[PDB]
């Protein structure tokens, strides 16, 4: 994973003339921000393991 | 591992005799075995009681905002 | 070998040993004494004269009298069979259930477990006392040092906790009456019996008693702590156990040290102090721990000398603390039992970390509000809050209410309180403050919050009031 | 309004000043005590430092 | 052998009055039969007063005291980094030995004037307040003064962690080798601490010199000096080290005791006098060298814990008299929550600017000033309740600034960010909002800038300053961010 | 004679001098010294044993070690060659600019010049620092204490004074950075170099730097004070010059003394201070003088321990002082710089004659008003702060202006402040206040007055402020 | 003795303040240094040792008791005063007498609030 992208647009939020979602967008963006920060935080990758050398230092 | 030859000859000689035995490396001794098993417990607590012979796996989800 | 009393000045027994002259800390048993009159060597003064400290009392000792070095530190009976048992310092049952059939002995010097050996992941020992957990949360394995004024239910509290906690516990507990009122120990005895936690057909009580009461002669009191440490290490390390270790009172340890200091021909630090308060402390403290091999959850009564904390002794002590219990006489004067002041009573382990931020924050608001309030009372002391902002008035009152809400009955001391104990699990704790904080409550009387259990009880009480 | 006020201020000044009075008293203890404390500590320091000069 | 061996004349207290050893080198570290080391402090005509480094249940009289023939040096290297050592330079991290097989004398005195060059570098902590208001440079000395576990330590820690990014820089202008002296600090605490660093793994560039609670008194005593030598090492290798002395307070205590045991008199505050010299000399060794010495530095963060804010606490008084300023921590703000808990009205870096980045200077000068009134406006025409908008603004703003500097426990940061956010308030842009949202905002703003205005961040960092353009970049950015915060 | 180290008990080296003794105060050199270990004789303890004072570090020393008495007390390089030189106690080129080709040595025990030698008149030294002159009019040759506790730009101020003054006169300098941070001496160093007032191309300046930082044997540090004195006396009379003697910090001197006092066997009296406190000062201050053949205008930085002057030591100090600058940390906390205590910063030698009555009165009125103002404080903290009665307001404000006007920019800590320092020669000042006194600027308001040199600049500042 | 001899004896120790003092004097004359309140510390041991000797015994001891009414005379009610603390921590409650009421007449004048029997929690008559 990997996921692509659209910026804030506050004009959008207010307008939703599907009334049943009017509140939701304001809240839903903020849910977004949770993901936004969270993703910006972490990297994708750990390292890996040189098993050969670790086998040298694990007798099992 | 090794220094003073005058003691060392005998002292080191006895240590190798250990390795040259397979009823344990000359013996083991209850006392060690008791502590081993204890200490083995504790460090499992140290990093959780999963077994890191296997790795984790996760699950997935989504919901609709508006 | 044998030594001669060359000088007795109190329990500093100047012994000339010539014949041997073992190291310091070799226990000597005095010849010509029916008593196991231990002197533990303190100094090799030279001239193969040692300064020893009789742990014990003295008298009837014609000088020159022969002392035979017992040749080692106090070796004291060990094994699980100590649970229940009250042993004196020298490990003999002063429960007097005959003797004890030990397993081994131990030199009552026990050392610092290793830095590398520690497992050190503080986890709240919950207590169910709002005030405690919330404000002075305790950690499992933690060393909580109970500063507290005399008689302020200080003892009560500790006991009260012991009930609450030590019961729930699975590890054992040790009660060390160090320099304690024998009487209180008597009392203690009887609850313990009663409680059957000291079940006496059980030397497998959850609690071992070691008592080296107030009455002892100094040395005995001085050293008994070390002993206690040694025991608990036995149970922890050897028996696994999370020990809860009740010490009443480490102050007397301190006391004892200082008391001797003079006689130890020292330059005795300030106030007469033992300067070796410090070393003592370290040397003790490090024995205190919660190893990888378990916990000594350490309940350390700390009499606050002259309730001065400023007092170097406590001052030092703090370093070693992890949870500090300050019972606050001021508060006590406010009648409150609970009498704590948590701006004082703090716990290293009180953290947004360790115990949640909710706790912390709810607290921070509280700590704050109180802190502010604390700031205010004095201006108010003059002014009242009268021409001073209402929001403040509210908040002050709230802070106070919160204070009151912290007042919590004692189940143990229902006799004492009248009031019937309360114990409040965390959630209702949170809730409580959050609510009061919400001002939701506030349309209410301050005293409604007094000596409550959960907030409901305040509510209940509100009705009962109005 | 003002009459009421003026007596209230008057009153106000009454309480306060009493309040003041007790507090002074309390401090005064603290005073001497500490006062002596100084001395004491110091005397200590003297005696000690006079039993332990070079 | 002979002569420069002794028989323990008397022993008690780890104070060996030693018969013999007479032609001994002053302050020679000596060697015990036990293998414990000791130090020859007092050459009295008829004994040698030797402090035993270890402890004396472990020994007895007449015992052979052998000279080591050495006045103390401690192993030195830099393979101390990633290491927790004792004063003698031995693992206590218990990670096998240390790689610091050079040893270097502790008693080596402070350099001259000439081998120094004063500061003009900043030193950064990520702590907004710190870096701003008592802006610090490198080679310096500054007191952390405060009471107990206020995250007492935390302060150091977060700073150190903060240096991580700099150590993740490849500088040696900001790549800062960290030295932590733990005095009197029980192992447990220490353990946690180590652990904290470990977790942060800032430890890699770090010595942690640890004389926990335990340690026979000289040991705690020695440790700083040790740390000191070790730090001088970097300093002379152009390297910039930061040593934290935490704290001499405990040391002094011990030392007094040591003296007392030396049957020397309790000096002022029952503390002997040349405990001043002690630390003074100790502390003189912290410096910013000139270039000949690689320009290196040993930046000193001594820590002193006041007891009851007592600074007339003799030794504090002393230390203050040494210090190039002090970072005063207050409780209240802490209790209020507010961390910073500092009283900057009581915290100083006299220095101010040598210790800065122009960037910081740009907002901070003004801010400091503004806070000054702000704080002030708590006192004139207020002891606690009153109103007017002009000034109310100042308060509002102020309150904001409070938050803005309010930097909770645990917070390593980079300065431009700090400036970034600071700029918003300074330049009046959030005044509006409530404190509660500031933080939130701040965070939010941060990922935003971090991401986006990473460009910009690049720049500001680069310019060491915010250019007017970068400012403008801020202006819209912030406004917009705020707007985004809505909009 | 020869001595043996018989005891080294710390850096207190008790030497048993073998071939007799040398007299008291004799500087002794330890044989076997890579950096000659000057010992100052303190007591002839008897048994041809002296208690001596190490003036170096005592490391490595063999007990018994052989000492050869220098046959005198500490004798030190002296000569014109000290100008633009950093000397240590033992004169040593700690300028690190090679040995000082001094043309004279002197035993650093300089003593009290005679009663008769003392210029009975001095003339107010004007510093042009308004406040300074005004409240504590300094006299050329005067003994100025700068009491001030720590850190408050104190040193900065001091330096600045040096800028203002030492430059400005044919008056020479001795600066003794004693006990000071080696670092600050460094910093300081650079400033002179920079200033070119340490001009090194011609080594000369007019200045001796004597440094005895806080890493030196206290006795030695204690003695660096004497050293400087000895030198300066030479310049004072012999070179005839008004030497300006900066001592930083005489408190630490005293202190240095006290630390040792114990060890010296003296029971260091109350507050820990040496029982000899009086003699130490007495002799020292009495060693200091402005005689007829020159002036040592003696500027003594005085750390005020804990801002306690009632601290016996400062209390003593006061006796010697004839002009006192007590800097008020509270005022400092009031942010100022002028941070001084003003209603304590005096010269007993303010005069309606000598400073003329104008000055004098102005000061007295002013001092008074401030004192009065202080009284008003009592109302205000709890009872109003843009609020109560008004005539008093008038004064309040006036005082406040006076305060602000009393504030003057820092002239090198412009580096910090961005305020260009200012200075106002005396009349414009006196006048200045008189105008304010005259209540002229009342249409005008406060902050305009802050941190200025002359009043116009305040007027100007008002204008800037009207926006 | 009485205690061991089943008796309930009442000893009124009236008052230890002077004793302690005396002892202190003794100490000091014994050139034994003090600390607190210019006293040394084993006046605490003193008091403890004294007071532990007050007790209520089991049957074996005839059930006897030595009931202790120590008196400690405050001087200006300094709880704060260490030696008072000492004893307080020893005792099983205290009867603080407040002057003013007495002084007002009010015979007697107790500081009731402080007058407490901690260990008192039940030890009197059902009637009462």
Residue owning tokens 């390390």: C237
Residue B26: burial class (beta carbons within 10 Å; 0-12, 13-18, 19+): middle
* Both structure tokens of F20: 């007799």
Give residues with Cβ within 8 angstroms of E425, minimum separation 6. E397, E400, E401, E404, E431
* Cβ(C327)–Cβ(G103) below 8 Å: no
Is D19's CB within 8 Å of C381's CB?
yes
Q: Which residues of E touch F9 (CB under 8 A)?
A: 41-44, 49
Pick from C185, C188, C156, C184: which is nearest to C408 by CA?
C156
Phi, psi angles (nearest 5°) of residue F161:
-65, -45
3-state DSSP assignment of residue F415 = helix
Q: What Å distances lie between residue F103 and F79, F100, F208, F209, F228, CA to CA? A: 4, 9, 15, 17, 16
Contact criterion met (CB < 8 Å) for E484 and A36: no
- The 3-state DSSP composition of chain E as helix, strand, coil percent (nearest 5) reads 40, 20, 40
- Any chains having at least 3 CB pairs less than 8 A from chain B are A, C
Say yes or no for a CB contact (<8 Å) between C368 and E383: no
Largest CA distance in chain C: 83
d(CA F326, CA F328): 6
First to last CA, chain A: 35
Looking at the complex, does the CB of residue E119 fall below 8 Å from at least one CB of chain C?
no
What are the tokens at C457? 């009880």
Dist CA B65 CA A27 (whole Å): 7
Q: State the CATH class of domain E357-487.
A: mainly alpha
Topology at the third CATH level for domain B1-48: Methane Monooxygenase Hydroxylase; Chain G, domain 1 (6.10.280)
* Alpha-carbon span E351 to F153, nearest angstrom: 9
Q: Read off the tokens for C420.
A: 């019937």
E71-356 CATH choice from 3.30.70.20, 3.30.70.420, 3.40.50.300, 3.30.360.10? 3.40.50.300
Distance of alpha carbon G94 from alpha carbon G89, whole angstroms: 10
F42 sits in the region (left: phi over 0; alpha: psi -120 to 50; else beta) called alpha
* F464 min Cα distance to partner chain E (Å): 18
How many CB pairs below 8 A link E and F? Answer: 153
Q: Distance between CA atoms of C77 and C80, rounded to whole angstroms?
A: 10
Residue with the two structure tokens 């009681």: B49
Alpha-carbon span E41 to E258, nearest angstrom: 10
Question: Cα–Cα distance between F327 and F320 in angstroms, integer?
Answer: 17
Determine whether the interchain pair E322/F181 forms a contact, defined as Cβ–Cβ distance below 8 Å.
yes
Interface of C with B (CB under 8 A): 119, 292-293
**Beta pairing partners, E42:** E49, F9
Burial class (CB in 10 A: 0-12, 13-18, 19+), F444: middle
Q: Report the residue of chain D nearest E264, measured CA to CA.
A: D52
Closest-CA residue in chain D for F51? D54
Q: Quick one: tokens of C276?
A: 């070796």
Distance from CA of E360 to the nearest CA of C (A): 30
From the candidate CATH numbers 3.10.20.80, 3.90.1150.10, 2.40.10.170, 3.40.50.10140, the one assigned to the domain spanning F1-73: 2.40.10.170
CATH 3.40.50.300, domain C74-349, yes or no? yes
Residue F72 pairs in a beta bridge with F27
**CA proximity to E197, closest of E248, E245, E154, E243:** E154
Report the candidate in F403, F336, F373 with the shortest Cα–Cα distance to residue F153.
F336
Q: Token digits for C316?
A: 């030092």
Q: How far apart are CA E455 and CA E124, in angstroms?
A: 22
Cα E162 from Cα C425, distance rounded (Å): 39
The C-alpha R_g of chain C, in whole angstroms, comes to 24
The rounded distance, in Å, linking the Cα atoms of C259 and G46 is 11
Q: Say how far apart CA D47 and CA E266 lie, in whole Å.
A: 11
Q: What stretch(es) of chain E map to CATH 2.40.30.20?
A: 1-70
Q: Which chain D residues have any C-beta within 8 angstroms of a chain G C-beta?
A: 29, 33, 40, 44, 47-48
DSSP string, C11-67: TEEEEEE-S----TT-EEEETT-SS--EEEEEEEEETTEEEEEESS---S--TT-EE
Beta-carbon-side half-sphere exposure of residue C273 (alpha carbons within 13 Å):
25
Domain segments of chain F as ranges: 1-73, 74-349, 350-467
Q: How many Å apart are CA C435 and CA C427, to the nearest integer? A: 12
HSE value, Cβ hemisphere, 13 Å, CA-based, for F446: 12
- Provide CATH code, domain E1-70: 2.40.30.20
Query: DSSP assignment, residue F324?
Result: E
Chain B residues within 8 Å of chain C (Cβ atoms):
42, 45-46
Beta bridge partners of F212: F178
Q: Does A33 contact E at CB distance below 8 Å?
A: yes
Please count the other Cβ atoms lying within 10 Å of the Cβ belonging to residue E288. 27
Q: Which residues pair with C8 in a beta bridge?
A: C13
Tokens of C188: 């203690």
- The H or E element that residue F89 is part of is none
Q: For residue F148, count other CB atoms closer than 10 A to its CB.
A: 28
**A52 burial level (CB within 10 Å; 0-12, 13-18, 19+):** exposed
Partners of B65 on chain A (C-beta within 8 Å) are 24-25, 27-29, 31-32
Tell me the backbone φ, ψ of residue A49, rounded to 5 degrees: -130, 125
Task: Determine the Cα–Cα distance for residues C140 and F430; give it in Å rounded to an integer.
Answer: 72
For F183, name the nearest residue in chain E, comparing CA atoms only.
Answer: E113
Query: Which of C206, C176, C213 minimizes the C-alpha distance to C288?
Result: C176
**C-alpha dist (Å) from residue F331 to C57, F152, F341:** 62, 10, 7
- At a CB cut-off of 8 Å and minimum separation 6, what does F237 contact? F291, F293, F294
Going through F57-137 in order, the beta strands assigned E by DSSP cover 66-73, 75-77, 85-87, 105-107, 124-125
Q: Are F and A touching by the rule of 3+ CB pairs within 8 Å?
A: no
Please spell the DSSP secondary structure of chain A, one letter per residue.
---------HHHHHH-SSGGGHHHHHHHHHHHHHHHHHHHHS-S------HHHHHHH---
In Å, how far are B49, C74, C141, F122 from B42, measured between CA atoms?
Answer: 10, 31, 16, 85
Rounded CA-CA distance F123/F100 in Å is: 35
Contact check, Cβ <8 Å, G44/C255: yes
Technique that determined the structure = cryo-EM
User: How far is the C-alpha of E6 from the C-alpha of E47, rounded, in Å?
Assistant: 9
Tokens 């800065």 sit on residue: E356
Domain boundaries, chain B: 1-48
Q: Which CATH number is correct for F350-467, 1.10.1140.10, 1.10.287.1770, 3.40.50.300, 2.60.40.10?
A: 1.10.1140.10
Q: Is C320 left (phi over 0), alpha (psi -120 to 50) or beta?
A: alpha
Q: Which residues have a Cβ under 8 Å from the Cβ of E255 and sit 6 or more positions away?
A: E217, E221, E271, E272, E275, E278
d(C-alpha F245, C-alpha F139), whole Å: 14
Contact G33 D29 (CB under 8 A): no
Name residue, tokens 């003592």: C280
Instruction: Write the DSSP assignment of C193-254 as a string of letters.
Output: HHHTTT-SS-S--SEEEEEE-TTS-HHHHHHHHHHHHHHHHIIIIIT--EEEEEEE-HHHHH
CA distances from F115 to F120, F284, F288 (A): 10, 15, 12
Nearest-Å Rg of the Cα atoms of chain F is 25
Q: Is C48 exposed, middle or buried (0-12, 13-18, 19+ CB in 10 A)?
A: middle
What's the length of chain B? 66
Torsion on CA atoms E389, E390, E395, E397, rounded to nearest 10: 110
Write the secondary structure of E47-116 as one string of H (helix), E (strand) and C (coil): EEEEEECCCCCCCCCCCEEEEEEEECEEEECCCCCCEEEECCCEECCCCCCCCCCEEEECCCCCCCCCCE
Look at C293 and B46 and tell me if their CB atoms are within 8 Å: no
CB neighbour class for E381 (10 Å; exposed up to 12, middle 13-18, buried from 19): middle
Residue G6's contacts (CB-CB under 8 Å, 6 or more residues apart) are G61, G62, G63, G64
From residue F179, alpha-carbon distances to F222, F268, F323 in Å are 9, 20, 23
Q: Among residues E169, E167, E173, E165, which one has the least CA distance to residue E82?
A: E167
Q: Is F202 exposed, middle or buried (0-12, 13-18, 19+ CB in 10 A)?
A: exposed
How far apart CA F34 and CA F416 sit, in angstroms, is 44
C208: β partners:
C83, C174
Q: Do residues E341 and E333 touch, judged by C-beta distance below 8 A? A: yes
Residue of C263, C319, C359 to mutate for E, most E C-beta atoms under 10 A: C319
Nearest-Cα distance to chain C for D10, in Å, is 14
Q: Which of C261, C382, C386 to mutate to test the interface with D (most CBs of D within 10 A)?
A: C382
| Selection from G106, G46, G28 nearest residue G82 by Cα | G46
How many CA atoms, within 13 angstroms, populate the side-chain half-sphere of residue C266?
A: 32
Cis before residue C282, ω within 30 degrees of 0? no
Structure tokens at C165: 């906690």
Active site residues of G: 118
For residue E304, the SS3 value is strand
d(CA C153, CA G11): 26
C29 within 8 A of C56, measured Cβ to Cβ: no
Helix, strand or coil for residue F284?
A: helix
Touching E: C residues 183-202, CB under 8 Å: none
Element (H, E) at E454: helix E454-463
Is the CB of C72 inside 8 Å of chain E's CB atoms?
no
Longest Cα–Cα distance of chain A, Å, equals 69
- Count Cα neighbours of E141 within 13 Å in the Cβ-side half-sphere: 24
In this structure, what token pair is assigned to residue E326? 């002090």
Q: Where in chain E is the domain with CATH 3.40.50.300?
A: 71-356
Comparing CA positions, the residue from F335, F425, F405, F344 lying closest to residue F146 is: F344
Task: Return the structure tokens found at E206.
Answer: 């770090």
Q: For residues E249 and E305, is the Cβ–Cβ distance under 8 A?
A: yes
Question: In D, which residues are within 8 Å of G29 by CB distance?
Answer: none
Residues in C touching B44 (Cβ below 8 Å)? none
- B contact test, residue of A28, A54, A60 with most B CBs within 10 A: A28
Work out whether strand C27-30 and strand C66-72 pair parallel, antiparallel, or are unpaired: antiparallel
Least Cα distance to E301 among E145, E455, E170 occurs for E145
Written as six digits, the tokens of D14 are 């009454």
Give the DSSP letter string of D1-54.
-HHHHHHHHHHHHHHHHHHHHHHHHHHHHHHHHHHHHHHHHHHHHHHHHTSS--
Question: Tokens 């030295």 appear where?
Answer: E179
Report yes or no on chains G and C touching (3+ CB pairs under 8 A). Answer: yes
Q: How far apart are CA E420 and CA E426, in angstroms?
A: 10
| CA nearest to F87, candidates F96, F432, E73 | F96
E300 phi/psi in degrees, rounded to 5: -120, 130
Interior angle at CA F195, CA F192 and CA F197, nearest 5 = 70
Residue E396's CB: how many other CB atoms inside 10 A? 18
DSSP E391-422: HHHHHHHHHHHHHHH---SS----HHHHHHHH
Q: Which helix (H) or strand (E) holds F220?
A: helix F218-233
Backbone angles phi, psi at G5, to 5 degrees: -110, 40
Half-sphere exposure of C84 (CA within 13 A, CB side): 20
Tokens found for residue C14: 């100047």
G36·C271 Cβ contact <8 A: yes
- Tokens 């009930």: give the residue: C163
D49–E266 C-beta distance less than 8 A: yes
Strand C66-72 with C2-9, pairing: antiparallel
Q: CA-CA distance, E324 to E327, in Å (whole number)?
A: 10
Range E330-366 burial, b when 16+ CB lie within 10 A, else e: bbbbbbbbbbbbbbbeebbbbbbbbbbbebbbbbbbe
The answer to whether domain C350-466 has CATH 3.40.50.970 is no
From residue F181, how far is each of E110, E142, E286, F220 by CA, in Å? 11, 13, 10, 16
Whether E contacts C, i.e. 3 or more CB pairs less than 8 A apart, is yes
How far is C281 from C285, CA to CA, in rounded Å?
6
The pairing of strands C323-326 and E206-211 is unpaired
Half-sphere exposure of F416 (CA within 13 A, CB side): 20
Cis bond upstream, residue F338 (ω within 30) = yes
Tokens of C220: 């005995």
Tell me the C-alpha distance between A24 and E461, whole Å. 39
Strand order in the sheet with C207-212: C86-87, C207-212, C173-178, C242-248, C295-303, C143-148, C323-326
Using alpha carbons, select from C110, C113, C114 the residue that is nearest to residue C25.
Answer: C110
Contact at CB, F262 and D49, closer than 8 angstroms: yes
User: Nearest Cα to F40, choosing from F222, F255, F231?
Assistant: F222
Residue C130 phi/psi, 5-degree rounding, is -60, -55
User: Are the Cβ atoms of D54 and F270 closer than 8 angstroms?
Assistant: no
């Amino acid at each position: 994973r990997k996921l692509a992208l659209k910026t804030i647009d506050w004009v959008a939020f207010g307008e939703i003339i599907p009334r049943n979602q009017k509140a939701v967008a304001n809240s839903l963006k903020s849910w977004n921000e949770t993901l936004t920060s969270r993703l910006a935080t972490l990297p994708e990758k750990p390292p890996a393991i040189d098993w050969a050398y670790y086998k040298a230092n694990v007798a099992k | 591992l090794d220094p003073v030859q005058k003691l060392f000859v005998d002292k080191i000689r006895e240590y190798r005799t250990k390795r040259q035995t397979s009823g344990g490396p000359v013996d083991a001794g209850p006392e060690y075995q008791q502590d081993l098993d204890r200490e083995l417990f504790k460090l499992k607590q140290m990093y959780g009681k999963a077994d890191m012979n296997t790795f984790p796996n996760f699950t997935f989800e989504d919901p609709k905002f508006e | 070998t044998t030594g001669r009393i060359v000088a007795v000045i109190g329990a500093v027994v100047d012994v000339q040993f010539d014949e041997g002259l073992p190291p310091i800390l070799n226990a000597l048993e005095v010849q010509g004494r029916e008593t196991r009159l231990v002197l533990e060597v303190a100094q090799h003064l030279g001239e193969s004269t040692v300064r020893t400290i009789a742990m014990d009392g003295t008298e009837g000792l014609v000088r020159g009298q022969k002392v035979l070095d017992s040749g080692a530190p106090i070796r004291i009976p060990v094994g699980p069979e100590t649970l229940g048992r009250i042993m004196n310092v020298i490990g003999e049952p002063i429960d007097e259930r005959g003797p004890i059939k030990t397993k081994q002995f131990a030199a009552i010097h026990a050392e610092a477990p290793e830095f590398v050996e520690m497992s050190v992941e503080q986890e709240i020992l919950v207590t169910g006392i709002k005030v405690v957990d919330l404000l002075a949360p305790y950690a499992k394995g933690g060393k909580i040092g109970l500063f507290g004024g005399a008689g302020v239910g200080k003892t009560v509290l500790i006991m009260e906790l012991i009930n609450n906690v030590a019961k729930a516990h699975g590890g054992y507990s040790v009660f060390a009456g160090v320099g304690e009122r024998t009487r209180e120990g008597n009392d203690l005895y009887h609850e313990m019996i009663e409680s059957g936690v000291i079940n006496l057909k059980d030397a497998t009580s959850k609690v071992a008693l070691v008592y080296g009461q107030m009455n002892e002669p100094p040395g005995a009191r001085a050293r008994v702590a070390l002993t206690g440490l040694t025991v608990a290490e036995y149970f922890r390390d050897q028996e696994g156990q999370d020990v809860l270790l009740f010490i009443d009172n480490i102050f007397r340890f301190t006391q004892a040290g200082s008391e001797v200091s003079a006689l130890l021909g020292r330059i005795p630090s300030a106030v007469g102090y033992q300067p070796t308060l410090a070393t003592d402390m370290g040397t003790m403290q490090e024995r205190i721990t919660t190893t990888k091999k378990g916990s000594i959850t350490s309940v350390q009564a700390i009499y606050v000398p002259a309730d001065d904390l400023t007092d170097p002794a406590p001052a030092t002590t703090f370093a070693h603390l992890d949870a500090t219990t300050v019972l606050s006489r001021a508060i006590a004067e406010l009648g409150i039992y609970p009498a704590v002041d948590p701006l004082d009573s703090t716990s290293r382990i009180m953290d947004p970390n360790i115990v949640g931020s909710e706790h912390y924050d709810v607290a921070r608001g509280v700590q704050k509000i109180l802190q502010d309030y604390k700031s205010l009372q004095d201006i108010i002391a003059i002014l009242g809050m009268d021409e001073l902002s209402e929001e403040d008035k509210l908040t002050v009152s709230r802070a106070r209410k919160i204070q009151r809400f912290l007042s919590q009955p004692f189940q143990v001391a229902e006799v004492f309180t009248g009031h019937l104990g309360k114990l409040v699990p965390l959630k209702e704790t949170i809730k409580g403050f959050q609510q009061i904080l919400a001002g939701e409550y506030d349309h209410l009387p301050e005293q409604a919050f007094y000596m409550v259990g959960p907030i409901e009880e305040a509510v209940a009480k509100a009705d009962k009031l109005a | 309004s003002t009459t009421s006020e003026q007596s209230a201020r008057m009153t106000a000044m009454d309480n306060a000043s009493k309040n003041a009075s007790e507090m002074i008293d309390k401090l005064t203890l603290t005073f001497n005590r500490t006062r002596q404390a100084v001395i004491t500590k110091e005397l200590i320091e003297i005696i000690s430092g006079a039993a332990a000069l070079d | 052998d002979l002569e420069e061996t002794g028989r323990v004349l008397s022993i008690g207290d780890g104070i060996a009055r030693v018969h013999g050893l007479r032609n001994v080198q002053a302050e020679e570290m000596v060697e015990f039969s036990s293998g414990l080391k000791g130090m020859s402090l007092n050459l009295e005509p008829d004994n040698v007063g030797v402090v035993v480094f270890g402890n004396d249940k472990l020994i007895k009289e007449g015992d052979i005291v052998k000279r080591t023939g050495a006045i103390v040096d401690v192993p030195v290297g830099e393979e101390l980094l990633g290491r927790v050592v004792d004063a003698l330079g031995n693992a206590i991290d218990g990670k096998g030995p240390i790689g610091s097989k050079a040893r270097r004398r502790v008693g080596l005195k402070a350099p001259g004037i000439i081998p120094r060059i004063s500061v003009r570098e900043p030193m950064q902590t990520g702590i907004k307040a710190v870096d701003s208001l008592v802006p610090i440079g490198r080679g310096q000395r500054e007191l952390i003064i405060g009471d107990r576990q206020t995250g007492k330590t935390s302060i150091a820690i977060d700073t150190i962690i903060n240096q991580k990014r700099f150590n993740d820089g490849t500088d040696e202008k900001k790549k800062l080798y960290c030295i932590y002296v733990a005095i009197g600090q029980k192992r447990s605490t220490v353990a946690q601490l180590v652990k904290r660093l470990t977790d942060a793994d800032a430890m890699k560039y770090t010595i942690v010199v640890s004389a926990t609670a335990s340690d026979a008194a000289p040991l705690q005593y020695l440790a700083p000096y040790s740390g000191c030598s070790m730090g001088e090492y970097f300093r002379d290798n152009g390297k910039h080290a930061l040593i934290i002395y935490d704290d001499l307070s405990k040391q002094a205590v011990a030392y007094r005791q040591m003296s007392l045991l030396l049957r020397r008199p309790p000096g002022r505050e029952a503390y002997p006098g040349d405990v001043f010299y002690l630390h003074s000399r100790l502390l003189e060794r912290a410096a910013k060298m000139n270039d000949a010495f690689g320009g290196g530095s040993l930046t000193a963060l001594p820590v002193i814990e006041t007891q009851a804010g007592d600074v007339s606490a003799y030794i504090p008084t002393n230390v203050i008299s040494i210090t190039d300023g002090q970072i005063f921590l207050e409780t209240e703000l802490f209790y209020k929550g507010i961390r910073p808990a500092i009283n900057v009205g009581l915290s100083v870096s006299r220095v101010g600017s040598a210790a800065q980045t122009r960037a910081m200077k740009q907002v901070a000068g003004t801010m400091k000033l503004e806070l000054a009134q702000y704080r002030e406006v708590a006192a004139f025409a207020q002891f606690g309740s009153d109103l007017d908008a002009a000034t109310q603004q100042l308060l509002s703003r102020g309150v904001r600034l409070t938050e803005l500097l309010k930097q909770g426990q645990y917070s390593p940061m980079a300065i431009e960010e700090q400036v970034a956010v600071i700029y918003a308030g300074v330049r009046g842009y959030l005044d509006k909002l409530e404190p509660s949202k500031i933080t939130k905002f701040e965070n939010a703003f941060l990922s935003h800038v971090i991401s986006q205005h990473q460009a910009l961040l690049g720049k500001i960092r680069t310019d060491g300053k915010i250019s007017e353009e970068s400012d403008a970049k801020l202006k819209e950015i912030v406004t917009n961010f705020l707007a985004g915060f809505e909009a």
